Design a protein around this ligand. Structure first.
Ligand code: ZN
Ligand code: ZN
Ligand code: ZN
Ligand code: ZN
Lengths: 234, 234, 234, 234
DNA sequence: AGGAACATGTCCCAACATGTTGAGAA
DNA sequence: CTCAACATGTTGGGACATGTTCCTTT
């Protein structure tokens, strides 16, 4: 009640920042990212690949930490955790405590923390350099609850904070993205981007006609992302 | 689960890449390759010839490893293995462990690895130069499970990664192709190449509103570029 | 797992049976009963009045027990309990254990049992005679979970069994009705009674062949005979 | 070893037979019996009990055997067990061996064991006299595998031998019915009755037009019910 | 407080998917 | 060694299910 985890973006000296795959919005997609809202839509307990980018390799012993907080200010001080139901269910993973919302997949060096003061949960992993011929590293997350789970997130939007820190635990970089765990990411995603379009519509716009639905959605995706970089330029 | 090995193409210092041009005559193969999908269609336990291309002769001790991973991101962290039924089968030649999906044929120097940290399976063979009169080295594989095997791949599409490495295991080159092990390769290939065609024969147009003159310029050219390349499907 | 308690109607020596005729005025109830389904629609934790009818006054020590079981046979063996979230709620009045779904209201003699052999839950109260001027005894229930509560009933229809017994617990009578705890009782009732109607109004003509002259007569004396008795919408 | 037991409808002095609740060819189900085929279509691990009926209720202690045997004149020797895949799947129920096809939940009297010589699988339960306020008995059946699982029944038909046997285990009854555990008991059921009735249909056949998809099923829940009561040619 | 208008998890079933079997082609 | 017909588990997404928000109403 006297300290909330900072969510201010910060590239730092290593140009740290995140990247995500490109997905559709079909009623079959299990995970899909919206550059228009910097928000990930994923089904319960399904893999969420997050790409980590760097301009220069960080010092030895650098770790990456994932932590979730509530987006709305009236809930910001409330620790995000699993609901009574899903909490009362153990998984093959004997590493992550049954109360943690975020898990890391395929990494036995992962470590789950319960802050003794803030009581906030978080999972940390060693920073690994990109594979030879690659420009980024990628971590695979999982969210063990539906944003709607009663007794848990209870329909409250959450934000995921990814920090890059050194052996001492000092901040080296930080980025973030919103998350919504739901039954149909495709549907929910289309709905939100649809409500966003019918809003910031004002001014002089050039018109480009595109052939094909897939090609169009890519062009539209790259377009809405650019309109975001401007949304907060001043 | 287990971390995901890189699947990014990397020709490296030797311009490493794969080829799939092996006639039907001589060792009448029942498999077939589709360049339109970069996917091979083969039957369970049947020879699959793959061509290795390199610009200059690699150093002494170079090897060639083969590893299979699940294509879809929600399965990428799961290790690709054989199904219980086929695993306990006696189709084992001794050299290859009963749990490996990928096998090398006609090479007694092949070594099968069951990683102790990533739990991933793979098979390695010493790199061999092309035959006198050829500019490529052939290698023969065998897939011990149907892509549909329950308990196994379970109808989940897989991707085979071929990496070139030095005696130590350092990456020198990498390439890959999709694989589907079925009972009727010819059929399944027609169907999939057919579904691919229908996907690029839909003439529906969409309009996009672009803000900023320069931006429009960039997007337009991007489109004209894809446009002046649409007329070639004949 | 747990054996399934009998749900067969048995009026017994006292002609025991239930009734659901309680006006809206006085204790304005938000629940509603559908005789066309013998199913009660009520909201979470809201009073549900039920009438007890008997031909002759029962012996001293007679009690009335209430037990809920899942309707569908594939769930019948699962004990009906509250969900984790609502179970840890503070809506507990003390008398009733936090895990019980069914509660008795306005009766401090009510006893809650958590069977040590069947693990089934139930609540009992001493049988009380009708009020001067009435031929039925009223009892008030409270359902502490929504039929949709995950971790709990999980959208699975339940059935409430009311049994009349002697001081020892021997069966003297039994009756029952279905129950659905939802947020909008009125709506859900209309929908279900509506789906019931459409089920008994289909107007598509199909064909049926027979291989006899006698037996045919029976299915002949009923066919063009049921299409007559329809003095409801004509 | 021995051989395959009888399956000739032999009620005996005590008489014996069973029954199944209402089951329509509607694909809106998870199980259904086709009297015109004597085949119990049911999904995987979905409880599907059968009614116990007996005129002269045998002496307490008597038991009802239930076994599975292939109806094909070549596999009748092979024991009916679970596929290698599902075998790994160790269900919570430790009462039934993780290799037995049949199960019976919510019944401590459940008996499971491997034959000492032939090494067969069987389940036996004590004939519980119709309890207070009833007239018959009901046991909860299951099938932990599909009739198509490879490494198991492998697309091979089976019969559930239900013979009432005294405490000792001496013959007393003999009833039976074929089973086809699948994923679509509805479709599958009709896809058989079709080709079934497709044969032998030349002669005097009256007509009858029934209006009402449900009524049609009602005139079928009796007419066809007499195709086993009137059709006594053999 | 009764009730459209959301918000959001499940279900239905016609495709679709895919190993079998078998008769015919070169 | 190719197709046609089957035999059979899985899927895609519109329809349905179901708690929540908030204006209009006694
Ligand atoms: Zn939850
Ligand atoms: Zn297999
Ligand atoms: Zn609840
Ligand atoms: Zn099986």
């Amino acid at each position: 009640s006297s300290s909330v985890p900072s969510q201010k973006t910060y590239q730092g000296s290593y140009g740290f920042r995140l990247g995500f795959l490109h997905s559709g919005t079909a009623k079959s997609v299990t995970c899909t990212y919206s550059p228009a809202l910097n928000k990930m839509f994923v089904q319960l307990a399904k893999t969420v690949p997050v790409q980590l980018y760097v301009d220069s390799t960080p010092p030895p012993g650098t770790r990456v930490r994932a932590m979730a907080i509530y987006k709305q200010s009236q809930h910001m001080t409330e620790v995000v955790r699993r609901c009574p139901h899903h909490e009362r269910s153990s998984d093959s993973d004997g590493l992550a405590p049954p109360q943690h919302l975020i898990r890391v997949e395929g990494n036995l060096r992962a470590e789950y923390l319960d802050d003794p003061n803030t009581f906030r949960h978080s999972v940390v992993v060693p920073y690994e350099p990109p594979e030879v011929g690659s420009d980024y590293t990628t971590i695979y997350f999982k969210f063990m609850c539906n944003s709607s789970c009663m007794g848990g997130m209870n329909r409250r939007p959450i934000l995921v904070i990814i920090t890059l820190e050194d052996s001492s635990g000092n901040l080296l970089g930080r980025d973030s993205f919103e998350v919504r765990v739901c039954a149909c990411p495709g549907r929910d995603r289309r709905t939100e981007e649809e409500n966003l379009r019918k809003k910031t519509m004002d001014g002089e716009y050039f018109t480009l006609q595109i052939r094909g639905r897939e090609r169009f959605e890519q062009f539209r995706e790259r377009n809405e992302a650019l309109e975001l970089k401007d949304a907060q330029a001043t």
